[PDB]
């Protein structure tokens, strides 16, 4: 039952990567949570069709909902709205990428659906921590994973953006200037994700 | 009834069943005491091969040292001779320093020559597992090492 207009009721595996850095203020992080909730609201949330997982990284993954979890979509909405604001001084795109590659998506058990990761970067990971970034991106590529980078804030590292796209055919970047643009581009983003529909 | 084992002579031994041998150790070997529920242990202290002191330990708390020259200690302090205590009435019986424990059952003597002695009670029949050999009528199996392997070399079993 689509809430307003959309229901991407197809086999899909989806993971979110809500950034936990201090760059996104408390209000900005709340807007991001609203984005993720309103996003999953328009998907057929169930292990049969759509698997959703939110993974806040604040220099360490903080998965609140796992793609293997099976609960009422209302409960998942509540949990997503309840993601705490870490407010860390430095996030780590590479660390969350490794987490999803090894501990979230390393035990393929449902090829019917596809693997999509929404990296909502809002801060620049220090170069010293970018040693294995390309390696993990390529590894996810091998695992049939499409990374959709989202350059939320002006400080969002853009070099990594379009570099994730460079090492993949379907990796699309949604570079935004503020969280407000998320509400504007919500429909476009859901549409794009449903173009790569596993049916 | 009661068995008897004595560390007589100079570095000699006589198990509870008659088997005897010679052993001049240095590490205060366990003369007697059950190997399942120890609850006490007579220890024959040794110095440079000579029989120096006969110690008794109750469980893990009470330590008493008798020595061959008549001196006594609690483990860290000296004490007078009669020294009645929790069991272990350490006295002079007939010129020999007698250490008697009846609640557990044994009597340790050290005569002038320094020949130790022990009189374990029957209730340790086949139960004692010290250097004085298990208290079974069979005297040929009194080299039961702590490892549980019956050896024939007296020094292996003693060590």
């Amino acid at each position: 039952p689509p809430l307003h207009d959309f229901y991407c009721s197809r086999l899909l595996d989806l993971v979110f990567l809500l950034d936990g850095s201090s760059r996104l203020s408390e209000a900005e992080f709340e807007v991001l949570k609203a984005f993720v909730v309103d996003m999953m609201e328009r998907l057929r949330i169930s292990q049969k069709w759509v698997r959703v997982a939110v993974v806040e990284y604040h220099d360490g993954s903080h998965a609140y909902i796992g793609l293997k979890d099976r609960k009422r979509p209302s409960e998942l909405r509540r949990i997503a709205s309840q993601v705490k604001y870490a407010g860390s001084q430095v996030a780590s795109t590479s660390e969350v990428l490794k987490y999803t590659l090894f501990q979230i998506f390393s035990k393929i058990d449902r090829p019917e659906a596809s693997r999509i990761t929404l990296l909502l970067m809002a801060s620049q990971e220090p170069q010293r921590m970018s040693r294995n970034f390309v390696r993990y991106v390529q590894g996810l590529k091998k695992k049939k994973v499409i990374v959709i980078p989202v350059g939320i804030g002006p400080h969002a590292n853009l070099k990594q953006i379009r570099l994730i796209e460079k090492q993949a055919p379907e990796n699309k970047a949604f570079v935004l200037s503020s969280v407000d643009e998320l509400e504007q581009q919500r429909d476009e983003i859901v549409s794009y994700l449903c173009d790569l529909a596993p049916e | 009834s009661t068995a008897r084992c004595s560390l007589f002579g100079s570095d000699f031994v006589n198990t509870f069943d008659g088997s005897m041998y010679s052993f001049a150790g240095y590490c205060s070997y366990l003369l007697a005491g059950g190997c399942q529920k120890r609850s006490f242990s007579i220890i024959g202290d040794f110095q440079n091969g000579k029989r120096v002191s006969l110690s008794v330990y109750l469980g893990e708390f009470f330590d008493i040292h008798l020595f061959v020259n008549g001196t006594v200690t609690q483990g860290d302090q000296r004490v007078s001779m009669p020294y009645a205590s929790k069991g272990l009435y350490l006295e002079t019986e007939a010129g020999y320093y007698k250490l008697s424990g009846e609640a557990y059952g044994f009597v340790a003597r050290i005569d002038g020559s320094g020949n130790f002695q022990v009189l374990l009670s029957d209730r340790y029949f086949n139960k004692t597992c010290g250097l004085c050999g298990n208290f079974n009528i069979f005297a040929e199996d009194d080299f039961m090492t702590q490892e549980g392997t019956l050896t024939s070399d007296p020094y292996d079993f003693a060590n």
Binding site: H58, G87, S88 | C35, S41, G59, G75, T145, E147
Partner: protein, 378 residues
């Protein structure tokens, strides 16, 4: 925030002005109140970090990452196992036991050979291991007593750099059997068999190390399902031979059999609780380690050597989680490095072993080791 309890009476006394929440002794601002961990105050936004997960002090709360940390199945001392899920326990059985095996996808079958290592009946330690990596054909590595590597019976001159194996001497006479960045067995030839193991094996191993999911309760699982209440049954279930005696009544107080050692055992395995290790106490509770030290010193051939082993085991446990205590001096134990070598607590392994100079292309992703490194420029 336990409301409904403040139901006694008013009292005419001082207070915070309007909004400041009374801190320990100050009326600090509501937002500025710090989180507390291990009796320490940390301003909001602090990034206190655990082994692999990091926590951040939000408003009066810690937002803690919930990743999986690498496992460890240390088997130091006289049968002093510690399952991947920290499950400090002792099992003195003399036979070949399956330390850990990847039951789901067979990729290693580490096995320990245990034998009585002293006169006391309560003195059993592993003397050998039988790493059985089936990926590399069927090599049976045999990291024997005394740090002696042996592949398929044939001895091997370390370092070995086969397909995935990287069996190479560590800083202090301990062969480090690496693998495809998933196994990091360390074996010093006497006891220690620290088995690092990456999270990819979470909840996929068996044997004495039990599962790796992260719950201690399941760690006593036999291959038959039901977990064992007593340690003896659990250990027996993982026995290789059909002939070795099944352990009965795993003894807990070896010091009773040797009353003479009680004084030394009590007064020696107490530095663990002494202020010298108070820095680590919070990092790791020395309850299992103190018990292990007492069981070792009063149960083995050489009391002082086993005291060294136990205290060093606890020090290594602390070091693996940050804090690095001193614990090295006469009265304690000392490394007494050979001529030329020096102690230099927390050195670096890479820049020595001229083999490294020959191969500068190699990397240096290794931390401090506290070994016998060479002096600078050598």
């Amino acid at each position: 925030h336990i409301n409904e309890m403040c139901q006694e009476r008013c009292v005419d006394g001082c207070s915070c002005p309007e909004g400041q929440l009374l801190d320990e002794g100050l009326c600090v601002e509501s937002t500025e109140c710090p989180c507390v961990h291990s009796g320490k105050r940390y301003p909001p936004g602090t990034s206190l970090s655990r082994d692999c997960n990091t926590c951040i002090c939000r408003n009066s709360q810690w937002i803690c990452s919930n990743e999986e940390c690498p496992g460890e199945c240390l088997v130091t001392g006289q049968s002093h196992f510690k399952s991947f899920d920290n499950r400090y326990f002792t099992f003195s059985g003399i036979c070949q036991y399956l330390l850990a095996r990847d039951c789901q996808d067979h990729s290693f079958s580490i096995v320990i050979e245990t034998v009585q290592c002293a006169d006391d009946r309560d003195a059993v330690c592993t003397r050998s291991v039988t790493v059985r990596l089936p990926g590399l054909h069927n090599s049976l590595v045999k990291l024997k007593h005394g740090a002696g590597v042996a592949m398929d019976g044939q001895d091997v001159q370390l370092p070995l750099l086969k397909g995935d194996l990287r069996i190479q001497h560590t800083v202090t006479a301990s062969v480090r059997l690496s693998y495809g960045e998933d196994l990091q067995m360390d074996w010093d030839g006497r006891g220690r068999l620290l088995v690092k193991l990456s999270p990819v094996y979470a909840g996929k191993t068996c044997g004495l190390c039990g599962n790796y999911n992260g719950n201690q309760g399941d760690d006593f699982l036999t291959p038959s399902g039901l977990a064992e209440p007593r340690v003896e049954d659990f250990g027996n279930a993982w026995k290789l031979h059909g002939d070795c005696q099944d352990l009965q009544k795993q003894h807990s107080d070896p010091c009773a059999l040797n009353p003479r050692m009680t004084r030394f055992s009590e007064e020696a395995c107490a530095v663990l609780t002494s202020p010298t290790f108070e820095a680590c106490h919070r990092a790791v509770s020395p309850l299992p380690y103190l018990r292990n030290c007492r069981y070792d010193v009063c149960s083995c051939s050489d009391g002082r050597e086993c005291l060294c082993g136990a205290l060093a085991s606890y020090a290594a446990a602390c070091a693996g989680r940050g804090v690095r205590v001193a614990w090295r001096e006469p009265g304690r134990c000392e490394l007494n490095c050979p001529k030329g070598q020096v102690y230099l607590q927390c050195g670096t392994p890479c820049n020595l072993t001229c083999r490294s100079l020959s191969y500068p292309d190699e990397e240096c992703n290794e931390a401090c080791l506290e070994g016998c490194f060479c002096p600078p420029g050598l």
